[PDB]
Amino acid sequence: KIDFLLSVIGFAVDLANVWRFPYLCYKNGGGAFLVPYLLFMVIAGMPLFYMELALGQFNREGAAGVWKICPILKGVGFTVILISLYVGFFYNVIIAWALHYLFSSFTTELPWIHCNNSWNSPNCSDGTTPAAEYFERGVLHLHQSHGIDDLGPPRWQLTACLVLVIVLLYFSLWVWITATMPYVVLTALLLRGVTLPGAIDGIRAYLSVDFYRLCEASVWIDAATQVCFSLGVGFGVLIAFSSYNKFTNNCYRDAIVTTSINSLTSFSSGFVVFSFLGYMAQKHSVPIGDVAKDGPGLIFIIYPEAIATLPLSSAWAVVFFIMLLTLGIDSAMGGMESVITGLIDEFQLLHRHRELFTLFIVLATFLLSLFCVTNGGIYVFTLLDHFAAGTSILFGVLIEAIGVAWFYGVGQFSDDIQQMTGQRPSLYWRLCWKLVSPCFLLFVVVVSIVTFRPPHYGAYIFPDWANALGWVIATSSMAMVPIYAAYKFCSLPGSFREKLAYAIAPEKDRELVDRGEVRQFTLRHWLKV
Ligand SMILES: *[C@@H]1O[C@H](CO)[C@@H](O)[C@H](O)[C@H]1NC(C)=O
Ligand SMILES: *[C@@H]1O[C@H](CO)[C@@H](O)[C@H](O)[C@H]1NC(C)=O
C-alpha cells in the first residue's frame, strides 16, 4: 500500500507537468486548451497507458525486445530511442538554467527585483518587467544575437553548469522527501496566489472557453502531444520500467489512479500559474495576453516574481529551485537510462563494455546540447521543442497501437491479460484499443502534417532553412520503421508468401507456422472487434 503510493507519486509530478503545461496553456488561451486536453485524455491517453503497462509487464523484455509478437514492426523500438535522445538534448538546458538561478539566489537582495543594474535597458517600466529583462539579458544575453543565423560562442557561465549536470548524470548512471516536496512547495505557492489581489480575473480567464479557437488545429495538436508528454507514453520508458515489475501486478488499478492524479496535478499547476499571471496583469495595467511572451521560459519569468512577493524570499527561492533541479534531474535520468538499457539489451556486442558506451553517449549528448547555451540558444531550444516530439511521437504511438492490436489480436492480448492478472478487459478497453484510439491518432497526424504553423519566438519569424532542418530531424526518427521492415522482409528466406508469413506471425508460433498454420492468412482474425 505504501509502496503503491510512492510509485503513484513518481508518475504524478514530473517536468512536463510543471514546465510545459503552463506554457502550452498560455499559448492557446487557457480553457480552449483545457477542454481538448481532457477530451483527448479520457479517450486515447488512459487506454494507451494501460496498454503499454500491460504489454511491458507481460513480455518482460526490453523496449525493442517486446516486438516478438510482430517482427516486421520492430523499427518502432528505435524510433522511440531516437525521440528520447532528441528530448534529452534539451532536457539538460532546463537543469542548467535552474542551477544558474539557484547559484544566483544566495543573496539577501535578489537580482530579479528592479531595473537598475548593468543588463537593464531604458525601456523598463518597474515597458518590460524587471524579471523578464533579467532572464533575457543577464542569464541568456539574447540581445546580442540577430537570430538563428548568428549564434556566437557559448557562454562559459552556462557551460560551467552543463558540465556539472553531465557529471552528475554520468556518475548516477555509470528519497521520500524527493517525491513529496513539490506538493508542499506548490501548495504554499497556491495559497499566496489565491489570496493575492487581482487574481480573480486571472482565474476567470482560465476557467473560460472561447469557441473561436476551438476550430483551429494547433490546439488539438498541442493537446495530443502534451498528453503523451505528461503520461509518458511514446518514449519507451514505460516498458523499460515495467520490465522489472511483478508478474502478477494489477494493471487497471495502476492505470486509473496514476492518470487521475496526473490530471489533478496538471490542473493545479495551470491554476497557480494563471492566478499569478492575473495578479501581475492587474499590477502592471496590461491585458493578460500582453504581460508575457508565449515562450518556453514562462516559468522563469513568472515564478521568480511570485517568490519575490512572498515574505523572506531568499529561502523560498532556494527551496523552489532545489525542487526544480531534482525534478529535472530525475526526468532526464529516466530517458537516459531508457536509451542506455534499450541499446545495451538489443545488441550483443556491447555486453561487457558498458562504462565506455555510457561515457561516450554522455559525451555525445553534452556536445550536442552545447548548441543551446550560445547567445541565441532560445531559438535552437524552440526548434528542438517544436520538432523533436512533434508529429513523430504521434506517428510512433499510432504505429505501435495498430501493430499490437490489428496484427496480434485484441482477443489474444485480452487472453494474455487474463493469464497474467485475475480478470479480463471489458468491451470498453477492447473497443478503445481496436478502433477509437487509432481513428483519432491518424486524424491528428494528418492534421499536424497538413497545416503550416511555422515556429516563432515572439515577433521573430524563423526562416525557411530552419523549417527544412526541423522537418529533416523529425523525419529522421520517423523513417526508422520502413527501412527495418524492408531489411527484415528481404532477409527472410523462402518465397514471398513464406517471407510475409514469418514476418507478420508472432515468434511464439515457430513450430506451427512451418506446418501450414498461419493465423493472419484469413479474414476472421481481422474482423474481430
Ligand atoms: C542605480 O544606479 C545608479 C548608478 O549607479 C544610481 O542611481 C544608484 O547607484 C542606483 N540606484 C538604485 C535606486 O538602485
Ligand atoms: C526600446 O526603446 C527604444 C527607444 O525608442 C526602441 O527603439 C526599442 O525598439 C525598444 N525596444 C523594444 C524591444 O521594442
Curated annotation (Swiss-Prot):
<dbReference type="GO" id="GO:0009410">
    <property type="term" value="P:response to xenobiotic stimulus"/>
</dbReference>
<dbReference type="GO" id="GO:0005102">
    <property type="term" value="F:signaling receptor binding"/>
</dbReference>
<dbReference type="GO" id="GO:0042220">
    <property type="term" value="P:response to cocaine"/>
</dbReference>
<feature type="binding site">
    <location>
        <position position="88"/>
    </location>
    <ligand>
        <name>dopamine</name>
    </ligand>
</feature>
<keyword id="KW-1133">Transmembrane helix</keyword>
<feature type="transmembrane region" description="Helical; Name=5">
    <location>
        <begin position="175"/>
        <end position="196"/>
    </location>
</feature>
<dbReference type="GO" id="GO:0045121">
    <property type="term" value="C:membrane raft"/>
</dbReference>
<feature type="transmembrane region" description="Helical; Name=8">
    <location>
        <begin position="310"/>
        <end position="351"/>
    </location>
</feature>
<feature type="transmembrane region" description="Discontinuously helical; Name=6">
    <location>
        <begin position="216"/>
        <end position="244"/>
    </location>
</feature>
<keyword id="KW-0769">Symport</keyword>
<dbReference type="GO" id="GO:0035725">
    <property type="term" value="P:sodium ion transmembrane transport"/>
</dbReference>
<feature type="binding site">
    <location>
        <position position="14"/>
    </location>
    <ligand>
        <name>Na(+) 1</name>
    </ligand>
</feature>
<dbReference type="GO" id="GO:0007595">
    <property type="term" value="P:lactation"/>
</dbReference>
<keyword id="KW-0908">Parkinsonism</keyword>
<feature type="binding site">
    <location>
        <position position="14"/>
    </location>
    <ligand>
        <name>Na(+) 2</name>
    </ligand>
</feature>
<dbReference type="GO" id="GO:0046872">
    <property type="term" value="F:metal ion binding"/>
</dbReference>
<dbReference type="GO" id="GO:0016600">
    <property type="term" value="C:flotillin complex"/>
</dbReference>
<feature type="transmembrane region" description="Helical; Name=2">
    <location>
        <begin position="31"/>
        <end position="62"/>
    </location>
</feature>
<comment type="similarity">
    <text>Belongs to the sodium:neurotransmitter symporter (SNF) (TC 2.A.22) family. SLC6A3 subfamily.</text>
</comment>
<dbReference type="Pfam" id="PF00209">
    <property type="entry name" value="SNF"/>
</dbReference>
<feature type="topological domain" description="Cytoplasmic">
    <location>
        <begin position="409"/>
        <end position="425"/>
    </location>
</feature>
<dbReference type="GO" id="GO:0016020">
    <property type="term" value="C:membrane"/>
</dbReference>
<feature type="glycosylation site" description="N-linked (GlcNAc...) asparagine">
    <location>
        <position position="123"/>
    </location>
</feature>
<dbReference type="GO" id="GO:0021984">
    <property type="term" value="P:adenohypophysis development"/>
</dbReference>
<dbReference type="GO" id="GO:0006865">
    <property type="term" value="P:amino acid transport"/>
</dbReference>
<feature type="transmembrane region" description="Helical; Name=9">
    <location>
        <begin position="352"/>
        <end position="375"/>
    </location>
</feature>
<dbReference type="GO" id="GO:0044877">
    <property type="term" value="F:protein-containing complex binding"/>
</dbReference>
<dbReference type="GO" id="GO:0042053">
    <property type="term" value="P:regulation of dopamine metabolic process"/>
</dbReference>
<dbReference type="GO" id="GO:0005330">
    <property type="term" value="F:dopamine:sodium symporter activity"/>
</dbReference>
<keyword id="KW-0532">Neurotransmitter transport</keyword>
<keyword id="KW-0966">Cell projection</keyword>
<dbReference type="GO" id="GO:0035240">
    <property type="term" value="F:dopamine binding"/>
</dbReference>
<keyword id="KW-1023">Dystonia</keyword>
<dbReference type="GO" id="GO:0015872">
    <property type="term" value="P:dopamine transport"/>
</dbReference>
<feature type="binding site">
    <location>
        <position position="10"/>
    </location>
    <ligand>
        <name>Na(+) 1</name>
    </ligand>
</feature>
<dbReference type="GO" id="GO:0008504">
    <property type="term" value="F:monoamine transmembrane transporter activity"/>
</dbReference>
<keyword id="KW-1003">Cell membrane</keyword>
<feature type="binding site">
    <location>
        <position position="262"/>
    </location>
    <ligand>
        <name>Na(+) 2</name>
    </ligand>
</feature>
<comment type="subunit">
    <text>Monomer. Homooligomer; disulfide-linked. Interacts with PRKCABP and TGFB1I1. Interacts (via N-terminus) with SYNGR3 (via N-terminus). Interacts with SLC18A2. Interacts with TOR1A (ATP-bound); TOR1A regulates SLC6A3 subcellular location. Interacts with alpha-synuclein/SNCA. Interacts with SEPTIN4.</text>
</comment>
<dbReference type="GO" id="GO:0010039">
    <property type="term" value="P:response to iron ion"/>
</dbReference>
<feature type="binding site">
    <location>
        <position position="327"/>
    </location>
    <ligand>
        <name>Na(+) 1</name>
    </ligand>
</feature>
<feature type="binding site">
    <location>
        <position position="331"/>
    </location>
    <ligand>
        <name>Na(+) 1</name>
    </ligand>
</feature>
